Enzyme design. Structure first.
Site, PDB file in Angstrom:
ATOM      1  N   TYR A   4       0.788  -1.239   0.000  1.00 25.51           N
ATOM      2  CA  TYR A   4       0.000   0.000   0.000  1.00 25.51           C
ATOM      3  C   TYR A   4       0.817   1.285   0.000  1.00 25.51           C
ATOM      4  CZ  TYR A   4      -4.008  -3.007   0.667  1.00 25.51           C
ATOM      5  OH  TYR A   4      -4.949  -4.009   0.530  1.00 25.51           O
ATOM      6  N   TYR A  61     -12.428  -5.201   8.163  1.00 28.61           N
ATOM      7  CA  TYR A  61     -11.364  -5.470   7.203  1.00 28.61           C
ATOM      8  C   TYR A  61     -10.995  -6.941   7.254  1.00 28.61           C
ATOM      9  CZ  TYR A  61      -6.977  -5.777   4.787  1.00 28.61           C
ATOM     10  OH  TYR A  61      -5.951  -6.219   3.971  1.00 28.61           O
ATOM     11  N   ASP A  75     -13.569 -13.768  12.011  1.00 27.47           N
ATOM     12  CA  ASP A  75     -12.226 -13.555  11.483  1.00 27.47           C
ATOM     13  C   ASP A  75     -11.303 -13.200  12.628  1.00 27.47           C
ATOM     14  OD1 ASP A  75      -9.835 -12.757  10.344  1.00 27.47           O
ATOM     15  OD2 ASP A  75     -10.702 -11.457   8.850  1.00 27.47           O
ATOM     16  N   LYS A 132      -1.507 -14.948  10.911  1.00 26.23           N
ATOM     17  CA  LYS A 132      -0.553 -14.086  11.620  1.00 26.23           C
ATOM     18  C   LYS A 132       0.218 -14.813  12.724  1.00 26.23           C
ATOM     19  CE  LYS A 132      -2.909  -9.643  10.749  1.00 26.23           C
ATOM     20  NZ  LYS A 132      -1.883  -8.951   9.887  1.00 26.23           N
TER      21      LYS A 132
END
Ligand SMILES: Cc1ncc(COP(=O)(O)O)c(CNC2C=CC(CC[C@H](N)C(=O)O)C=C2)c1O
Ligand SMILES: Cc1ncc(COP(=O)(O)O)c(CNC2C=CC(CC[C@H](N)C(=O)O)C=C2)c1O
Ligand code: NA
Ligand code: NA
Lengths: 427, 428
Positions: A17, A144, A244, A273
Site C-alpha cells: 500500500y 477489514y 475472522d 498471523k
C-alpha cells in the site's frame, strides 16, 4: 546493503500500500532478536508492531528456530494431495483442541486473505448443497478481511475504496459499525443490524465479523454483547457465523481467542498471523462437521479449494512451536501486564491537543488523533527515539510482542506521548 | 506416525479438492531427499510430481537448506511496510534481470492465486486511472489461474464448476481453448473465436490473461507458440494489457527459462510461483512494466492497493534466491532437454495401448491422456507398489519430475505409466 541496493528497492520493488512514485523512506533491516529490529548501520529498534501483529514471541526465538531447522532436515515441503505428514497432523490436533468443541475440521491455507476466501467459499458451497439460494454476506462497517476480491467484498466500502472496483465486487450488506465500546450496551445500537437482517434473512449465507476488535478498519474495540446477539440471531435464522480472528487470535485481546469474551463459538473460524509466531505465512480456517460434510455430500463431492503449498510442513512446524509456547500459559499474565502498562502510560495522551481518543485492550494500545498522521515524518521521529512504530490514518498504536520488557514498552509509550505533543507530525 | 494419526487426518483435516465423507487413502510421508519421498513405513518412492511442479531441484537440497537456515539465523521474517531487506532486494534484482527487459517492477506475494489477484487488480487500477471503462478479462477456455474469488473468475467455467457460484462470480470472456498443438502445425482457423470476442468487446477488456504454451490444471494441454505471438500483436494493436500466468511454466519446466520465450514475446504483467522457491515453501511474484506501475500510483488511490501481512518474507526470499542461483549454473537446460528426449522415447509405446487417447511431451512434462477416468484409490496403490509417486487426475497420467532426476529413476516412472495403462483395471 549498499546505497545502490536501496536505490534498486525504491525504483523496482513495490511495497505494501505505497506509491511507486512518491515512496516515503524505508529502513534497511539486517536482522532481529528478542523485541528488537537491527538496521544496516547498527541502530537497534524496539519493535512496537510485532511485524503487523504476528511476532507475538518476538524475533529469533530459540524454540521457533529449532522447530524450523529440524523440519528443514526432514523436508521443508511435500504436496498435500493424497499425502499427509506429522507437522500438519500435530498442528491440526492443537487447533481443534484449543478452539470451541464444534470447530473440529481444519482447512490449512497460505494466508489470511485466502483463509477468508476459504470461509466465504465454505458458506456459499454449504448453502448450494442444502439447495438454499443464499449468496449475501452481512458484515459490519469499518471491517477489514484482506485484499483478494472475495475478502475485499466484505471490507468497509469506504476504507477499502470500493468505488475503484464498483461493478466487479459483489454487493454485500453493511450494518453500522458497532457503537457500544468494550463501556455500556445501548439497545439503540442493534437497530441498523436488525433492519438488514429482517429484510435479507432469507438470502444471507453468513454473517462475518472481526470479534471485539476491528483492526485495520480503525482499531475499534466494541462490546461483547454484540457477539452474543449475533450468535443468537444466526442460530434463530439458521445463518452461519464466520469469526475472522486472523488479528485477534492467539491471545492478543487478553483471551486465547476474542470470541471467548462473549463465550460464543462461530461456525467458521479464520486464523493466521500469530499462528506461526510471525515467522512465515500460513493460515487455518476451522469449521464444523455439519458444514464440512454437507459440502462433500453436495453436487461437487468436496470442498472446492486446494492451493499448491497447502499444509506446508515447514510452516506447520513453525506453527506447532508457536502454539507450544502458548501452551505454557505465560501469555495470559504477559498480556494482562501489558494491558495495565498501556492503560497507565497512554493516559497522559488524553491531555494532548492532537489526541481524539485513547483505548486499550490486552496487548493493543491505541492513540487516535484528531488529524491524519504524517507517516514518513512520524516514522523517522520514532526511529530517532530508537523505536519501530508504524502509524496510519489517525492511529498511533502499539501491538508489541508478548515478551516485551517493561522498560522496552516504556520507550514505546514515551515516544507516542512525545509524538502527539506536536502538530509537527500531522496532516 | 501411527494409524491413530491417520484416523485423525481422515476425520479432521481437509485436503485439496477431496471429499470428507467418502475419503480415499492418503500416504504418510516422514521425510524426503534427492528425488525420493520416504513413507512412514520406510518405503521410498521416486517422485514423479515435484510436489506439483515446484520441487525442480528435488528435496533436501544442500544449497536450499543452507540458505534457509542462514536466513533463519538473521531473521525468518520482518514486515515490509517501511522496511526492506537484502533477501528481497537480491530476489527482485534476479527476477528483473532474468525476465524480458520491460518487466522491471516487482510485487512479491504469498501464493499463486494471490499473484493472479494482484495482476488482475493491477489491470483494473491501470484503466481506472486512465479514466477508461474496462473491467472485463479475456481468457482462454481450459485455463486455470487459482481458486480465490478473482482468480476463479478467469478459470474455465465448466472445469471449475462456476454453476456453484452463478450470480456471485463476475462473467468474463472465454475464447475457445487453443487447438493448434506445440507438436504440430499452426491453423489460422484457430483464431476466429478469439478474434470475434476481441472485435465485439475490445473496448471493455482490461486485459487478456493466459497460461503460455501449457494449460495445466485444465487439461495439461500444449499449444502452438504462434498463439502468443498473435495475442501479443493484438494486445499491442488494441492497447490492451497482456497477463502471462507462468506460475506453473516458469523457471525452465517447458525447456525455456520462461514459456513466453517459445514465442519471444513479453507480457505486460507476469505471474510467478511454484519453482520460484524450489518448492520449499510458498512465495509468489507479479512483475509489470514501469508504465503500469507508475500509472496506478498516479490514480485516485495514490498507490497500488494491496499488501499482505507476510509480503516479502525474508525466509522465502532466501530460498528463492538459492533456487535461482542453482538455475544460474545453466545446468537445467541440458537436464530438461535430456528429460524431454527420454519422456518422448519411453512414453511413445503408450500410444498403442487401447486405454490411451494421447501422448504429449514438452520439456520436463510428460502426459498420457486416457479414454476413461482413473480409479484413484486403485491406481494410486498400484503406483506406490511400484515404488513411485505419480498422482493422476481425471484422464491425465502425467510426469513433471525434478530436473535432477537420474535416467534410471525416470525410467521407473515411465515403466510404471506404461504398465498402468496396459488394461482397463485401474479405470473408472
Ligand atoms: C482481521 C484480518 N483479516 C484478514 C487479513 C488478511 O491477512 P493477509 O495475511 O492476507 O494480509 C488481515 C491483515 N491485517 C492487516 C494489518 C495491517 C494492515 C495495514 C495497516 C495500515 N494500513 C498500514 O499501512 O500499516 C493491513 C492488513 C486482518 O487483519
Ligand atoms: C498456472 C497456475 N496459476 C495459478 C495457480 C495458483 O497457485 P496457488 O499457489 O494459489 O495454488 C496454479 C497452481 N494451483 C493449482 C493448480 C492445479 C490444481 C489442480 C490439481 C489437480 N486437482 C490434481 O489433483 O492433480 C490446483 C491448484 C497454477 O498452476
Ligand atoms: Na475445536
Ligand atoms: Na525484466
Amino acid at each position: 546493503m549498499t546505497t545502490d541496493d536501496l536505490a534498486f528497492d525504491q525504483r523496482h520493488i513495490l511495497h505494501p500500500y505505497t506509491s511507486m512514485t512518491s515512496p516515503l523512506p524505508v529502513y534497511p533491516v539486517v536482522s532481529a532478536e528478542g523485541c528488537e529490529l537491527i538496521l544496516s548501520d547498527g541502530r537497534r529498534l524496539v519493535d512496537g508492531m510485532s511485524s503487523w501483529w504476528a511476532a507475538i514471541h518476538g524475533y529469533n526465538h530459540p524454540q521457533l528456530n529449532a522447530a524450523m531447522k529440524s523440519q528443514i532436515d526432514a523436508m521443508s515441503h511435500v504436496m498435500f494431495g493424497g499425502i499427509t505428514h506429522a507437522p500438519a497432523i500435530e498442528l491440526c490436533r492443537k487447533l481443534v483442541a484449543m478452539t470451541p468443541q464444534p470447530l473440529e475440521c481444519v482447512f490449512l491455507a497460505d494466508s489470511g486473505s485466502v483463509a477468508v476466501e476459504v470461509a466465504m467459499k465454505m458458506a456459499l458451497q454449504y448453502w448450494q448443497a442444502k439447495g438454499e439460494a443464499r449468496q449475501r454476506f452481512l458484515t459490519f462497517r469499518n471491517g477489514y478481511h484482506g485484499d483478494t476480491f472475495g475478502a475485499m467484498s466484505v471490507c468497509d466500502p469506504d476504507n477499502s475504496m470500493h468505488s475503484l472496483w464498483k461493478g466487479y465486487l459483489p454487493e454485500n450488506l453493511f450494518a453500522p459499525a458497532p457503537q457500544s465500546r468494550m463501556g455500556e450496551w445501548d439497545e439503540r445500537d442493534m437497530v441498523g443490524f436488525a433492519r438488514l437482517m429482517a429484510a435479507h434473512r432469507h438470502e444471507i449465507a453468513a454473517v462475518i465479523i472481526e470479534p471485539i476488535v476491528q483492526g485495520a478498519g480503525g482499531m475499534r474495540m466494541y462490546h461483547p454483547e454484540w457477539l452474543k446477539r449475533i450468535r443468537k440471531i444466526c442460530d434463530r435464522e439458521g445463518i452461519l457465523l464466520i469469526a475472522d480472528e486472523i488479528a485477534t487470535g492467539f491471545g492478543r485481546t487478553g483471551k486465547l481467542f476474542a470470541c471467548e469474551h462473549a463465550e460464543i463459538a462461530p461456525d467458521i473460524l479464520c486464523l493466521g498471523k500469530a499462528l506461526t509466531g510471525g515467522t512465515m505465512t500460513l493460515s487455518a480456517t476451522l469449521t464444523t462437521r455439519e458444514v464440512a460434510e454437507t459440502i462433500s455430500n453436495g453436487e461437487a463431492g468436496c470442498f472446492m479449494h486446494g492451493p499448491t503449498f497447502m499444509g506446508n510442513p515447514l510452516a506447520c512446524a513453525a506453527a506447532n512451536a508457536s502454539l507450544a509456547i502458548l501452551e505454557s500459559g505465560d501469555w495470559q499474565q504477559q498480556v494482562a501486564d501489558i494491558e495495565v502498562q498501556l492503560r497507565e502510560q497512554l493516559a497522559p495522551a488524553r491531555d494532548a491537543e492532537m489526541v481524539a481518543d485513547v483505548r486499550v485492550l490486552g496487548a493493543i494500545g491505541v492513540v487516535e488523533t484528531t488529524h491524519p498522521v504524517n507517516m514518513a515524518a512520524l516514522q523517522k521521529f520514532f526511529v530517532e527515539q530508537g523505536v519501530w512504530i508504524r502509524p496510519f490514518g489517525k492511529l498511533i498504536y502499539l501491538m508489541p510482542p508478548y515478551i516485551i520488557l517493561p522498560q522496552q514498552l516504556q520507550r514505546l509509550t514515551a515516544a507516542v506521548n512525545r509524538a502527539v505533543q506536536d502538530e509537527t507530525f500531522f496532516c
